[PDB]
Amino acid sequence: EVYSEKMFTESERTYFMNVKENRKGDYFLNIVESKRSPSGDFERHSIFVYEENMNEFESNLLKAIAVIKQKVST
Amino acid sequence: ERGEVYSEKMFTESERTYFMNVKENRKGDYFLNIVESKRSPSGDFERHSIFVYEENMNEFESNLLKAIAVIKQKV
Ligand SMILES: [Mg+2]
Ligand SMILES: [Mg+2]
């Protein structure tokens, strides 16, 4: 791991933002959603993005988020 | 599609394809859904899906951009 940030929320949902380096030396982004169940177990949902797709992934996320931000401020 | 505000599909040169969706719940709140569909060596498609709700959108965006900035500066 090169970078790792844990984003708690006020609910039982926590997000992890991880940057890791592979063997070829390439970087990848890993976004994780971890949700606590009433039993104290965790469900985790994990997405990976290769550095070669980073600009396009970022542009696409920003566009989708922008829709929500506009609605919220609307 | 009723309940879907926004939907985009992103092919890559890898076995990973992405979907960025904005959905609307019963109350009219918007929420984000990010999906990675990964083709396995065998031909089965695994699907990974994350949801982010309105109350966490700004912080999620900020944290996502901060991690991406790490990659930007390290290339
Ligand atoms: Mg919490
Ligand atoms: Mg492909």
Numbering used by the authors:
A (entry chain B): 11 to 84
B (entry chain A): 8 to 82
Reproduce the article's own wording on this structure.
Crystals of selenomethione-substituted B. burgdorferi Pur-α 8–105 (L17M, F27M, I64M) belonged to space group I212121 and diffracted up to 1.9 Å resolution. The PUR repeat of B. burgdorferi Pur-α crystallized as a strongly intertwined dimer. Each PUR repeat is comprised of a four-stranded anti-parallel β-sheet followed by an α-helix. The interaction of two monomers results in a globular domain that we refer to as PUR domain. It exposes both α-helices on one side and both β-sheets on the opposing side. The part of the crystallized protein that is visible in the experimental electron density (amino acids 8 to 84) matches the homology region that was identified as PUR repeat (amino acids 8 to 81). In the B. burgdorferi case, the interaction relies on a dimer built by two identical monomers, whereas in D. melanogaster Pur-α, an intra-molecular dimer is formed by its PUR repeats I and II.
This sequence repeat-containing protein binds specifically to RNA as well as to DNA and prefers the consensus sequence (GGN)n, where N is not guanine. When searching databases for proteins with PUR repeats in lower species, we found that a bacterial hypothetical protein (Borrelia burgdorferi B31 gene bank entry BB0047) contains a single PUR repeat.
